[PDB]
Amino acid sequence: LTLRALERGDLRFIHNLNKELARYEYWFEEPYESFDELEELYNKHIHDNAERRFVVEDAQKNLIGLVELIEINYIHRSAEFQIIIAPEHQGKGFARTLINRALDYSFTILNLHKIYLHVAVENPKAVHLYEECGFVEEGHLVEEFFINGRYQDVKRMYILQSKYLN
Amino acid sequence: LTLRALERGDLRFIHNLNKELARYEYWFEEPYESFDELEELYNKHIHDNAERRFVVEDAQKNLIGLVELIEINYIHRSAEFQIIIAPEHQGKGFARTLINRALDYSFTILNLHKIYLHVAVENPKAVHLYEECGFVEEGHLVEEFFINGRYQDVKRMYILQSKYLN
Amino acid sequence: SQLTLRALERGDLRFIHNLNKELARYEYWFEEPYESFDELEELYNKHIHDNAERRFVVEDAQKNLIGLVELIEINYIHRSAEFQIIIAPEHQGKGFARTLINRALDYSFTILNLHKIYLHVAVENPKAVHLYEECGFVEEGHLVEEFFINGRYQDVKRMYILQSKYLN
Amino acid sequence: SQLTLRALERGDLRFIHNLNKELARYEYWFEEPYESFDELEELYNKHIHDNAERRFVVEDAQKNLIGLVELIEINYIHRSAEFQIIIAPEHQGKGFARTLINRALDYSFTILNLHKIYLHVAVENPKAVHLYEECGFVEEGHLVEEFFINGRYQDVKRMYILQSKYLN
Amino acid sequence: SQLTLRALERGDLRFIHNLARYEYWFEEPYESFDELEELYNKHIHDNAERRFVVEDAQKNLIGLVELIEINYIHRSAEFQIIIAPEHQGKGFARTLINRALDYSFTILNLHKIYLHVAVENPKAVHLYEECGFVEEGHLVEEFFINGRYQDVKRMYILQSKYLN
Amino acid sequence: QLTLRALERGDLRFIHNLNKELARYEYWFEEPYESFDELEELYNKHIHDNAERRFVVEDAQKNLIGLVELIEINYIHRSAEFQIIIAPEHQGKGFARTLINRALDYSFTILNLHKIYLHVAVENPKAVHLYEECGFVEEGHLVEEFFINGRYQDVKRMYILQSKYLN
Amino acid sequence: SQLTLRALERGDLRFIHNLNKELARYEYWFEEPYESFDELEELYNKHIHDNAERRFVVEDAQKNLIGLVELIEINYIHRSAEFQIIIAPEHQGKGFARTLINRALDYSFTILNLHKIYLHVAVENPKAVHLYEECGFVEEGHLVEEFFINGRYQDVKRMYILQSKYLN
Amino acid sequence: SQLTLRALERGDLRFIHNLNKELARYEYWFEEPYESFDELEELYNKHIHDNAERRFVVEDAQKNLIGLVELIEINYIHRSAEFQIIIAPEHQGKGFARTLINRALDYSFTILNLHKIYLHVAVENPKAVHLYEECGFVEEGHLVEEFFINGRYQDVKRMYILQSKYLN
Amino acid sequence: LTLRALERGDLRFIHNLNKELARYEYWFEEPYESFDELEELYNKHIHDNAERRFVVEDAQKNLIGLVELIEINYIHRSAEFQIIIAPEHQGKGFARTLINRALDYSFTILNLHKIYLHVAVENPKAVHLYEECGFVEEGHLVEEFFINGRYQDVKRMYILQSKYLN
Amino acid sequence: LTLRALERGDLRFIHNLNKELARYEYWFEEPYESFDELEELYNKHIHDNAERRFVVEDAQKNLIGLVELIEINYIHRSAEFQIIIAPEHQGKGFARTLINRALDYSFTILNLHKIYLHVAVENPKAVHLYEECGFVEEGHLVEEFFINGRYQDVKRMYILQSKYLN
Amino acid sequence: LTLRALERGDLRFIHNLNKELARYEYWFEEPYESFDELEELYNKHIHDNAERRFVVEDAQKNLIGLVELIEINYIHRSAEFQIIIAPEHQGKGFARTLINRALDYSFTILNLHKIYLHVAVENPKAVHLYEECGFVEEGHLVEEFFINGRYQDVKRMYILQSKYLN
Amino acid sequence: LTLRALERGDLRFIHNLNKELARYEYWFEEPYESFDELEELYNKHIHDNAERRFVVEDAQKNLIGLVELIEINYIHRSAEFQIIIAPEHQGKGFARTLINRALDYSFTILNLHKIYLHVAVENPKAVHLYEECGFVEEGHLVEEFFINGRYQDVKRMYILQSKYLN
């Protein structure tokens, strides 16, 4: 597997990765639900560095998933991490590799200090494998997001540049 | 049935759908009658969340209808629902499922509190259908809209998030 | 029927321009003179959203453009509007005028909810006057030397119809 | 006599705005609705050089503004224009209307070189109709339910005069 | 009762700002006077909403009348009435409502005027009924006001009933 | 058998080429211009202005034959200066008479103008005879009015009224 | 003698306005129509640095404003210009016209280096014609029905003078 | 109380800029860094109608500003927002924080109809944590080395309050 | 050989020609160096008639030279004439024809009275060329221009309209 | 006698002087004739160094005259000098001292290489004065300026920094 | 002494301070030579974060100098420091405190890692001042800058966040 | 090997060259990662000469590497040189020839005075290469950049035209 900076031609894969009416999606903190308004948001934030996205693809160049570093602050050197694996390539053991490739980019190139993420409390397997990757719970945000018709709690888990490098 | 977000390519469809039923059409509360005027109004409000529209295409991949949420207020958490099915694909039992899908999106994704709609009193079949989906009459607006050369009364019917979820 | 009325599009503008080349007339677009196609297209884009005037092109069964229907000087307080209809000489005399007039009135009285529709017809064209009379219009004025047409000040009949008469 | 006609100024806009506070009608400025003084001021500055309409403030020898004289819908191809006169409530009833109407016709036919001046007078006021008839106007139409004034569609008389009749 | 209506002008914006609630201007949220003033200059020519201030003989503003959601095809409009707390209870509400109805039905040529009134304010309901309004709807939990969803009576009056 | 069409931006270059063959200093709505880029900006600036009206003439094959210009238009006095410029390609085939009459017809039957005047070089008597056959009459012999081709040249101002043309 | 020509200033616009209204006629500023002072001031600001037209106020030794001298339609390729003189009635008939005309010709032939100065004068005003003749102007045209003055088309003489004749 | 909470205005910009200078920070305006006042004013003019953040200044009886209350990261789908409060050192410690915090929660839960209001407070400031806890907030996270303040990475307590708890 | 008024499409020619031939580049007396600066200055002074520029193109439309009338005074009817032939088409005798075409346009179209120019005193070939074209020496400006790191004298030579026409 | 930099308050003095000379005035090579035109041109070239003007006042600070440096070219370090003395203080021998002061300022502060000027050939008095001041004739421009109805030749005379310093 | 972010009103100060202390100053690495050009550049680069400037002023509200942090890189966390004190306030012992204030802002607020500076070797007083404030030499650049008409060797000195904070 | 200026068609080659080295790239001091924003920056700085790039191609016009002259300061006659070669054409000895060609273009055509470069301290083979080419160490920048997860030092090596030309 290999990561690559997101291109305009990849936007359609993003729109198909998470189908509408199931997740209220944002692009640089701007709501979007169609491809045409997504394309305009991409053109508007093509140079904005507050959020960086990369598409992962295998040797056959079959797009497998997306990694998003959002809410990037270059003074506190923190960023929220998100990983979205394609349904067809899910369960093949790529989660750990993609997460480690994201942490590698964040701590060895961007020179960030902290990488936090929000994970649904109702997904313990993800929480456990994130802990195995090197994350630690720093918060149990109560009713943070209204998802699928319910206010859900989320575990905020972080990892520091020191741990990953050493 | 497939409920997708509206794209610029679908503008020519809804326009042809609007000319089959004589209506003084509004796009974000702006009158329009030509396709060029519609296209420019679409480009002007492409990022306006005051109204959300979704096209309806069947299994054959043919576009058959439109679902509109308008007058969306995110303080009071209310929205007006409207559904349109082409005459060819009416009477096939799609309206019920599409209404349920719209209510699902409004109450499980947008986290809206109320969904109201106007239905012509002279169309009693639609009134009963909406009643079967959970809507309840809250008003009998007298001579609200001038339709087909006569001021007609319309029943205002609402449904709440509590009843839908519970 | 055989005729369909469709809202005016930018692609149809040049057809409008050609009609005015066949019928020598000092043309206006939203009360602003125009004679070049560029001036027309810039005035079209300027008033794309202005509802003071509404224009519908007429296309036959074979999607051939045959005429224009203009509702100008629309007023939403007095609920009045001046109607005008043009037909290409090729498709003139084929019994379309009456159907298009009825369609225009139908749009004005069942959709826009207007109250009155008036028009001007030259006194020297009594056939048109009779046709409008057959469609329901009635003379309310004989404007003397109102316009300067083809080298002479000509009188015009101001004829009108009301929503009540058309719907009832 | 002693009345003076003067081209409208930006400072006079508050007099114009005050005239229509005691007149219950939907006011227009260059065919554009206005209600507040702000709308009137921005429309004045928008059409400061537009010649489609002309306006003259009428004032006394004491420089007391008494009324207004408008020439709207001016067309320089057909050479027509709609005349309109308003006299302040505190100055109406002194017999100024006739002299001001003649001064309007004089300007229209001796300076602007117009061919026709028409006007609309309500059918429910034959005294004004007669005054216009004395000044040279003659009826050319009885427009039925043209406007909606004070809760009812009222008919109006369209009356005209030509440059030749006034100058000869 | 010699109260006169006047078109809203920029000089009156400050009064409307000082007159908590989630207010709108041509369906655009505003909290600050600068935000309101830019919205006013933006919709200076928009006729989707018409506003008029009512003042007494000595030019003392006492209330505001708003016509919003004006539709010139169906000829309807939502009416909102605000009276300054200093002039409340002096018997002007009836005059303001009837002067608004007179303008709507004698000048604008509208066909229907509807308004929303809190179900927990039956005195306003009775007053509107005296002015000629009739209940056409009992909207349930239409607005979140002061921490609770409140029902509101939608009541209308037609041009015919008022003119005749 | 020719046609007259209102001038459009696509035809601007043709006007520029015409002025390359006729060595003159050209104006557009009374503003000097010598570059096509300056002409195109002036065209877009005065697109809705009606102080001047221009029409290009075409044949059956839609080939450009020339230009007619009504400038210095006055809507109070109902006057306008006429100027016809036919390209050298189609000069001498007898099109001048037709286009002059068509310009007068448009001026007196559509625009409702009172007077149409024009300036013609005294050193070009053939044009004077042409305009005289088309109904024009000399009302002036302006002495050294324009500096043309290295010399101050006299020009005849010749006019025609709406009455004579329509009666 | 005692007469001084000064360059026009914004403060002098009122004088021009009042002066033009005393001789009622359609007023132009840089070939753009105007009637109101507010419109004149905005046109002055627009063409403050435009050299197509140059105007000069006339003042007495007591700085009493007498009249105006206008050089319009100035062409710096053909080196022509149209002259116009407007003296206030309260100072007319005192011989100022001759001196002001000579001063205008001097400025135009000794400072601007113009070639021709032409003018239009009403045929029906013979006194002015002979005045311009005495100043050196010669008739070059009899423009028939050129202008519309006080309800009647009038013929005007076009008279010219050249730089070589004035300087020699 | 005689403490008024007022929506932010242009004139208030130069106060918050000075208040931010007093408490050395890397300030943001709608998630955009700014340092100078001119940059802040351009950002205000840009985000004047942006409802993603809402700011309210505090002024005392003398009508002088003392504090600021910010609602940022306002999500109208999840109905969440980050709360921040700043009080000038000179007026700090006078028991105003609790009143202002309750007024901010009142506006967030009774007008904006929000669900959760959360905030970040430095662990090294236990007095602030206590005050927020007494105002109804409850700890939900202990962010480790989240922010870099005064040359060190400091932990912060993320504490929240729900609409249901506040209203009941 | 045709003389055409300068258009925007020729800006990149004179620019290169001004760098190849080291020239103190001004546009209407406002100095620049960048190409975008040239294009902005052109757009700013497109209607300015204080300076007139004309490119010279052959039959195949290859730009060979530039004719610049600058410091134009419409009261005194004078203007400074500058000719610049590109090195590619230099030594082919075009200089004489272009000088006369420029004199013709100045004296038969613009109705100018005097055309003067400055020529380096250390270039007697150009001096004799202009003398043949009708110009006559009227001044010997001492140390007038700083050329190749050296203050040099320049001859000012003039020609009058009466001489060219008569 | 003292020379002071020109300021707004002095404009009305400049204008007045120009009204006494039948000259076609300029301000940064822009024709003007009215005070309003002069004021707008002054505010347009307030920060332009192409021209520098200094007013001349006596001990009592009465306005005596004006010195103008125009066509200042900082690449060649030249500038044209013009001197105007009010008619009230003419014939008192101030022109000679003011020319010396102007030359001193130009060669000392501005560090200019040449200061040239034009003087009418039919005004030998000014020619003799400038010759006494150090200027030397370098050109006899034929019919350079149209003055008082006739084209007059003008002497262009210069003075170099070296002569004035050494 | 206090530090304040540079604003438009201060532009005429730095301009008069960059001409007094001769320097071909760049505004965000952009050539400028006029006040109006500097003002346009300020409003053009008002939001750019690559460079941060702070004007230092006295308790009497009298400006004394400027402090610039240019070449800011948020990945490597480097920034070049520069400080220019007005001649009138030099020798007062301010430079030391201003250097410490800039280092404080750079290491305690911006969370920068390295701060380097270029200082002329022929100015040993400044070099020793920097050495006293904690800077250390890392490079002896030969003929890097052109000062007083000569190529002068400069010294590149640096300091890190750890030393300053620890 | 021949050196040719950069064209838009070559941008993709540059993008592929950056795939070998996983470091954050800049175009005219603007951060970029994806190809779309690279093309946008290329079109943004198409006319800016502050940085000059030239591509290398062999006899068969097969792309080999890139030569960049960045941080060009025309006032101090300095420039930072950088050379990259595709992995498929390394070890061919092209390094020395391309470095000599670059230095020749810099010291003969651009007439630059100094050429400096930054080379990783942990890559001594490149240091020796540049030493043989003519460069000499003038600085040992401590922790200048953040590479591969660690602050690394870099040698600043220079060469003057006084040494190359002589």
Numbering used by the authors:
A (entry chain I), B (entry chain F), I (entry chain J), J (entry chain L), K (entry chain H), L (entry chain G): 5 to 170
C (entry chain A), D (entry chain B), G (entry chain E), H (entry chain K): 3 to 170
E (entry chain D): 3 to 21, 26 to 170
F (entry chain C): 4 to 170
Sentences from the paper on this structure:
This protein adopts a dodecameric structure and contains an allosteric site, making it unique compared to other SSATs. The allosteric site is located between monomers that form the hexamers of the dodecamer, and some evidence has been provided that shows when polyamine binds to these sites, the dodecamer tightens.
Despite crystallizing in a range of crystallography space groups, six structures adopted the apo-conformation of VcSpeG. Minor differences in residue positions were observed in the overlaid R1C2 (K23-E29) and R3C1 (R149, L150, F151, K152) crystal structures and models. On the other hand, only substituting the first eight residues of this loop (R1C2) caused a minimal (1.7-fold) decrease in activity compared to WT. Based on the kinetic results, it became clear that the region of the allosteric loop that was critical for activity was between residues 31–34 (WFEE). Since the R1C2 construct still maintained significant activity, it appears retention of acidity in the allosteric site may enable polyamine binding and subsequent catalysis, especially when significant van der Waals and complementary electrostatic interactions between Regions 1 and 3 were maintained.
